[PDB]
Structure formats: C-alpha cells, structure tokens
C-alpha cells in the first residue's frame, strides 16, 4: 500500500496548496472539489474517471472504491476551515498499512476507519487491525477518512 | 515560465544540498532521488502526486509533464557525475525563457535541449529560439535537462 499512501499524501499536499489561494469562496461539495483537483492536475498517480451528472471527473482508488475530497463543513468566520479525503471500500490489509502509514506521516488532523474517529491523529497497528473489517470476499468492506486543516 | 524558472534553480540547490548530506549511500535511480527531495520538503509548491511502479513521490512541472532528478551514471566512455533535472513537454516559449534563464543564472554544469546538449552551461535566446521545438495545438515537444557537476 506503499503508492496508495503517497497518493493520499501528495493530494493532500496538493489541495492544501490550492487551498491556500482561495479566498471569498468556498466549495459546497466533494463532488466540486474532487473535480477541480482532478482538473488542475492534483491526483495523477491515482485513477481518474467520469462522473458524470454535471460533467465532473471522480477519483478511485486502487481497489475500484471512490476517493472523494471534500470540505468540512465550509464556513465559520475567518480563517476557511479544512478539508477530507475519504476513500472507500478499502481492504482489511491496506486499511492497516494505510491508516498507519499516514498516522506515521503525522500530516493529518485526524484519521477515521470507519465509525472510529481517531481525532489524535493517532493510529497503531494494534488498533487498525481491530478497526479495519474483514473484506468481503474480494472487496473491501473499510472507509477512511483523512482530516487536514479543519 | 519565471515560476518554472525559479522552480528550476531552488530544485538544484536543494538537490545539490541534499547530496552533499549523504554519505555512505548513493540514488541509483530517478524514482528514489525524486521520491527523497520531495520528503524532504524541496517540492512545495509545485504539483506532486504517487508511482504507481514503486510508491515512490513523482514530481510535475505546470504543464503537466514530468519533472525528474536523477543521479549521474557510467556509460562505458564517460562518468559525467552529480545529477540531472529533466522537465518534459515544454512549450516552445517557456523552453527559450527557461532554457535562458538557467544559461543566465542556474549554476549548471551543461544544459540540454531535446537532442542538443550545451555541456558549456551557456544557452542564448537565439540557440533555444532554433532548438526549441514548435507546441502541437496546446502541447509542448520540449524535453529540457539541467546537469549538476561538470
């Protein structure tokens, strides 16, 4: 899961820095801010696709299981708030690796597998193994979800 | 093509520092020296993503090409050592203003462009003007290659 945690990473690093030029506006929807980083180049190591419902571009994982970035929850008086890429039916293993890994790369806010908030950032193996489900024959049963910023 | 051009000259000094820090160790490929730099901060601000072939971090230029920094090598007639940046799909203009630039005030030991390796470090507008081939629609055809140590 080695390409997988770097393409969280690099598209994190990639909408922190869109992030940081954008002012008096806000996106409203994952779908929106998935799209515009796909359109600026903010995601090539991952595989790219169409929507579509509007002409809008999504991100899937190495799996087939969506990636989606999106605004936490836009607004709240200054500073704009941050952002979370979320990516689905993630295997036992990867979800594992993966939630450590990027527990380790110590960027984010906040790590979530699925209903287990680790609002720390904080993620052992010991408790990825417990959290991450058992895959469903060939699909993976797992949600994770990256908090930066806000 | 200014924002490459400094992009360009911080990459080789970062490159050059981060060399100089390793001892006992040596990069033997692109995908590995890349990968390091970008760890160790040396691509802020510019578009990242991940290797699907190695899970190492690649590296962009604004036009969407790749931008890669590898090691010298031995070819069996030469030991041309240090390293190399190469930024592909260059357009026409920004090959003449970059290629220039990096002549003027890139410290580099040659400059390549597409099958013309300057190995004197000096490139005039007039020679990349020549050199640089024309963009097919929107698409740049330039293959451009900084090398350090000479």
Request: one cysteine or more; proline letters at 2%.
């Amino acid at each position: 899961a080695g390409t997988e945690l770097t393409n969280y990473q690099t598209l994190a690093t990639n909408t922190i820095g869109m992030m940081k030029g954008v002012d008096g506006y806000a996106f409203t929807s994952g779908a929106k801010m998935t799209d515009t980083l796909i359109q600026a180049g903010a995601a090539k190591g991952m595989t790219v696709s169409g929507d579509p419902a509007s002409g809008s571009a999504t991100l899937w994982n190495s799996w087939g299981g969506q990636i989606v970035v999106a605004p936490d929850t836009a607004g709240g008086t200054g500073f704009n708030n941050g952002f979370t890429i979320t990516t689905n039916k993630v295997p036992q293993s990867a979800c594992v690796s993966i939630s450590t890994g990027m527990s380790r790369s110590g960027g984010t806010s906040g790590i979530k597998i699925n209903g287990n908030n680790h609002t720390d950032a904080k993620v052992t193996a010991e408790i990825a193994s417990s959290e991450c489900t058992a895959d469903n024959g060939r699909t993976g049963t797992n949600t994770l979800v990256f908090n930066y910023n806000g």
